[PDB]
């Protein structure tokens, strides 16, 4: 049931490409970044986009993801 939807996996690639330098590998800081930088309508997908953006922040610093 953990598998993440499209519009969360769509909205993460538009963020982390465009704000790769304004981030980190911390979920609770990137939570606050994602609300600042784009209008999220509600809290649940706020920190659920932020989770997948952090899921790439420990990741695209290693290997060739679409980065």
């Amino acid at each position: 049931g953990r598998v993440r939807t499209k519009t969360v996996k769509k909205a993460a690639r538009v963020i982390i490409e465009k704000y790769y330098t304004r981030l980190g590998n911390d979920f609770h800081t990137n939570k606050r970044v994602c609300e600042e930088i784009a209008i999220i309508p509600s809290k649940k997908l706020r920190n659920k986009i932020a989770g997948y953006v952090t899921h790439l922040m420990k990741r695209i610093q290693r290997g060739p993801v679409r980065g």
């Binding site: 909205a11 538009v14 930088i37 309508p41």
Partner: protein, 226 residues
């Protein structure tokens, strides 16, 4: 006299509000009626009719305003004129769903084809800034047995609670020569104003991302003392 409980006050003006909305629909059907808005005061209360064609509720110096505050008076029991109508032209004339539901009510009574008339109105909502709409005509078309036409053109959601205010539904009836026709128009409204013409509070299936700024001065430093 003696006074009743709050739980029977809120249903009393809840059921007051429904009744005159029923009759004024029965009375101002031909006008692009589209609802009411009521203000209860301990003074002259103020009902307003949101009619598009505001002429046809007026006569010579408000004929069908003054008695349509008097039929409301001597039914519900107001004092002598603590209630008044005001006719009011609504903005986005064919974008509120009830209005053209009343228009194509009378446009089917002139004897048109259903496909000619609906392509009239389907092109009329979707030209009127509507993000999406779809119109259903049900009833006794060609044959003994009755069938159903629908004219989806545009985007429209169906579930969640935000099919409450991005959309409105209007269901009306058209008495034709045999039986009764069924009209069922639903229209999805644009987010655009955060304000007047549409709803606020954007639809949660998309993220409105913004650009980064001009990224000025990354280079070797500078300073000013002022």
């Amino acid at each position: 006299a003696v006074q009743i409980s709050k739980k029977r006050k809120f249903v009393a003006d809840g059921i007051f509000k429904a009744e005159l909305n029923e009759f004024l629909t029965r009375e101002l059907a031909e006008d692009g009626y589209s609802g009411v808005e009521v203000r209860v005061t301990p003074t002259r209360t103020e009902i307003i009719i949101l009619a598009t064609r505001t002429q046809n509720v007026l006569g010579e110096k408000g004929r069908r305003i003054r008695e349509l505050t008097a039929v409301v008076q001597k039914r519900f029991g107001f004092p002598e004129g603590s209630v008044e109508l005001y006719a009011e032209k609504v903005a986005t004339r064919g974008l509120c769903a009830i209005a053209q539901a009343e228009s194509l009510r009378y446009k089917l009574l002139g004897g048109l084809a259903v496909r000619r008339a609906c392509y009239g109105v389907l092109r009329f909502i979707m030209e009127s800034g509507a993000k999406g709409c779809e119109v259903v005509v049900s009833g006794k078309l060609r044959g003994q047995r009755a069938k159903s036409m629908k004219f989806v053109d545009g985007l429209m959601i169906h579930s969640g609670d935000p099919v409450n205010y991005y959309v409105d539904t209007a269901v009306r009836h058209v008495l034709l020569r045999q039986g009764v026709l069924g009209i069922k128009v639903k229209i999805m409204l644009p987010w655009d104003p955060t304000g007047k013409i549409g709803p606020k509070k954007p639809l949660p299936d998309h993220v409105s991302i913004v650009e980064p700024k001009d990224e000025i001065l990354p280079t070797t430093p500078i300073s000013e003392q002022k």
